[PDB]
Design a protein around this motif. Structure first.
Motif, PDB file in Angstrom:
ATOM      1  N   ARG A 105       0.787  -1.263   0.000  1.00  0.00           N
ATOM      2  CA  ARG A 105       0.000   0.000   0.000  1.00  0.00           C
ATOM      3  C   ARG A 105       0.829   1.331   0.000  1.00  0.00           C
ATOM      4  N   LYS A 106       1.842   1.470   0.879  1.00  0.00           N
ATOM      5  CA  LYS A 106       2.834   2.585   0.809  1.00  0.00           C
ATOM      6  C   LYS A 106       3.773   2.569  -0.443  1.00  0.00           C
ATOM      7  N   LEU A 107       4.253   1.403  -0.922  1.00  0.00           N
ATOM      8  CA  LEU A 107       4.914   1.286  -2.261  1.00  0.00           C
ATOM      9  C   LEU A 107       3.998   1.564  -3.506  1.00  0.00           C
ATOM     10  N   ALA A 108       2.691   1.241  -3.492  1.00  0.00           N
ATOM     11  CA  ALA A 108       1.725   1.694  -4.532  1.00  0.00           C
ATOM     12  C   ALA A 108       1.363   3.218  -4.532  1.00  0.00           C
ATOM     13  N   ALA A 109       1.330   3.891  -3.364  1.00  0.00           N
ATOM     14  CA  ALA A 109       1.541   5.361  -3.280  1.00  0.00           C
ATOM     15  C   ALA A 109       2.937   5.852  -3.814  1.00  0.00           C
ATOM     16  N   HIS A 110       4.067   5.352  -3.278  1.00  0.00           N
ATOM     17  CA  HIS A 110       5.443   5.724  -3.740  1.00  0.00           C
ATOM     18  C   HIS A 110       5.958   4.774  -4.883  1.00  0.00           C
ATOM     19  N   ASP A 111       5.290   4.848  -6.046  1.00  0.00           N
ATOM     20  CA  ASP A 111       5.361   3.798  -7.111  1.00  0.00           C
ATOM     21  C   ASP A 111       6.273   4.108  -8.344  1.00  0.00           C
ATOM     22  N   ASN A 112       6.425   5.383  -8.763  1.00  0.00           N
ATOM     23  CA  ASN A 112       7.231   5.775  -9.968  1.00  0.00           C
ATOM     24  C   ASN A 112       6.654   5.229 -11.328  1.00  0.00           C
ATOM     25  N   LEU A 113       5.348   5.437 -11.586  1.00  0.00           N
ATOM     26  CA  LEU A 113       4.643   4.829 -12.745  1.00  0.00           C
ATOM     27  C   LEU A 113       4.731   5.745 -14.004  1.00  0.00           C
ATOM     28  N   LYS A 114       5.469   5.258 -15.005  1.00  0.00           N
ATOM     29  CA  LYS A 114       5.654   5.914 -16.321  1.00  0.00           C
ATOM     30  C   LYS A 114       4.769   5.184 -17.384  1.00  0.00           C
ATOM     31  N   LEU A 115       3.696   5.851 -17.832  1.00  0.00           N
ATOM     32  CA  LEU A 115       2.730   5.291 -18.814  1.00  0.00           C
ATOM     33  C   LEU A 115       3.041   5.857 -20.233  1.00  0.00           C
ATOM     34  N   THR A 116       3.661   5.056 -21.121  1.00  0.00           N
ATOM     35  CA  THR A 116       3.838   5.456 -22.554  1.00  0.00           C
ATOM     36  C   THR A 116       2.674   4.861 -23.406  1.00  0.00           C
ATOM     37  N   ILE A 117       1.702   5.722 -23.753  1.00  0.00           N
ATOM     38  CA  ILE A 117       0.461   5.323 -24.485  1.00  0.00           C
ATOM     39  C   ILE A 117       0.748   5.346 -26.026  1.00  0.00           C
ATOM     40  N   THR A 118       0.565   4.207 -26.723  1.00  0.00           N
ATOM     41  CA  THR A 118       0.854   4.106 -28.189  1.00  0.00           C
ATOM     42  C   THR A 118      -0.377   3.515 -28.948  1.00  0.00           C
ATOM     43  N   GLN A 119      -0.954   4.272 -29.900  1.00  0.00           N
ATOM     44  CA  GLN A 119      -2.117   3.810 -30.708  1.00  0.00           C
ATOM     45  C   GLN A 119      -1.706   2.762 -31.799  1.00  0.00           C
ATOM     46  N   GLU A 120      -2.420   1.631 -31.791  1.00  0.00           N
ATOM     47  CA  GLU A 120      -2.063   0.398 -32.552  1.00  0.00           C
ATOM     48  C   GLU A 120      -3.016   0.040 -33.754  1.00  0.00           C
ATOM     49  N   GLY A 121      -4.307   0.420 -33.709  1.00  0.00           N
ATOM     50  CA  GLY A 121      -5.326   0.081 -34.742  1.00  0.00           C
ATOM     51  C   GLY A 121      -6.722  -0.067 -34.099  1.00  0.00           C
ATOM     52  N   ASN A 122      -7.371   1.057 -33.717  1.00  0.00           N
ATOM     53  CA  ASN A 122      -8.340   1.104 -32.565  1.00  0.00           C
ATOM     54  C   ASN A 122      -7.683   0.864 -31.154  1.00  0.00           C
ATOM     55  N   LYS A 123      -6.986  -0.272 -30.990  1.00  0.00           N
ATOM     56  CA  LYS A 123      -6.218  -0.640 -29.777  1.00  0.00           C
ATOM     57  C   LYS A 123      -5.164   0.395 -29.271  1.00  0.00           C
ATOM     58  N   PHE A 124      -4.955   0.417 -27.948  1.00  0.00           N
ATOM     59  CA  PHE A 124      -3.864   1.192 -27.306  1.00  0.00           C
ATOM     60  C   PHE A 124      -2.853   0.195 -26.664  1.00  0.00           C
ATOM     61  N   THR A 125      -1.617   0.175 -27.190  1.00  0.00           N
ATOM     62  CA  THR A 125      -0.473  -0.564 -26.584  1.00  0.00           C
ATOM     63  C   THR A 125       0.207   0.381 -25.543  1.00  0.00           C
ATOM     64  N   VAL A 126      -0.092   0.183 -24.247  1.00  0.00           N
ATOM     65  CA  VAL A 126       0.340   1.124 -23.169  1.00  0.00           C
ATOM     66  C   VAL A 126       1.482   0.452 -22.345  1.00  0.00           C
ATOM     67  N   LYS A 127       2.697   1.016 -22.426  1.00  0.00           N
ATOM     68  CA  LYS A 127       3.893   0.494 -21.706  1.00  0.00           C
ATOM     69  C   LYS A 127       3.898   1.037 -20.242  1.00  0.00           C
ATOM     70  N   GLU A 128       3.641   0.164 -19.252  1.00  0.00           N
ATOM     71  CA  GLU A 128       3.406   0.586 -17.837  1.00  0.00           C
ATOM     72  C   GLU A 128       4.672   0.286 -16.991  1.00  0.00           C
ATOM     73  N   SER A 129       5.593   1.262 -16.953  1.00  0.00           N
ATOM     74  CA  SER A 129       6.942   1.101 -16.355  1.00  0.00           C
ATOM     75  C   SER A 129       6.971   1.617 -14.890  1.00  0.00           C
ATOM     76  N   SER A 130       7.302   0.742 -13.927  1.00  0.00           N
ATOM     77  CA  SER A 130       7.209   1.063 -12.472  1.00  0.00           C
ATOM     78  C   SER A 130       8.359   0.447 -11.618  1.00  0.00           C
ATOM     79  N   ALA A 131       8.465   0.875 -10.341  1.00  0.00           N
ATOM     80  CA  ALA A 131       9.261   0.145  -9.308  1.00  0.00           C
ATOM     81  C   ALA A 131       8.918  -1.369  -9.057  1.00  0.00           C
ATOM     82  N   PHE A 132       7.647  -1.772  -9.230  1.00  0.00           N
ATOM     83  CA  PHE A 132       7.225  -3.203  -9.227  1.00  0.00           C
ATOM     84  C   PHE A 132       7.495  -3.942 -10.582  1.00  0.00           C
TER      85      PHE A 132
END
Length: 131
Positions: free
Chosen positions: A28-55
């Motif tokens: 719960r404290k690591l999900a608050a202090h998480d460092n989440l970098k979301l790179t959103i990329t459009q694929e063909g209607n679809k979204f390929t989203v790269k979810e880069s974190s401490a976990f």
């Protein structure tokens, strides 16, 4: 508009929201202090989203309207949809662990991706800046 690298700046009431979901003080404290970098990329209607974190680094390929199991930073399995409505990507989810609803509103305020997370009726607002 959405398709870019978005990193977490300030997380508002997220440990209270995760206490209503039933998660341990360490995770719960690591999900608050998480460092989440979301790179959103459009694929063909679809979204390929790269979810880069401490976990984890997870590449999430979602179609607009498909019912899928989405997972957040630690351990929260969410059956439901990302739907585009008036700018906003609306995350209509529910817990496959429980039955209870989770609502995640992705919206751009100028140059900030502001995610409003509602579990049952508890608001947590995470402000993501551009890189």
């Amino acid at each position: 508009a959405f398709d870019s690298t978005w990193k977490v700046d300030r997380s508002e009431n997220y440990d209270k929201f995760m206490e209503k979901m039933g998660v341990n003080i360490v995770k719960r404290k690591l999900a608050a202090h998480d460092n989440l970098k979301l790179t959103i990329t459009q694929e063909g209607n679809k979204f390929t989203v790269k979810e880069s974190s401490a976990f984890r680094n997870i590449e999430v390929v979602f179609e607009l309207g498909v019912t899928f199991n989405y997972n957040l930073a630690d351990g929260t399995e969410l059956r439901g949809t990302w739907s585009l409505e008036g700018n906003k990507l609306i995350g209509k989810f529910k817990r496959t662990d429980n039955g209870n609803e989770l609502n995640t509103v992705r919206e751009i305020i100028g140059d900030e991706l502001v995610q409003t997370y509602v579990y049952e009726g508890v608001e947590a607002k995470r402000i993501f800046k551009k890189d």
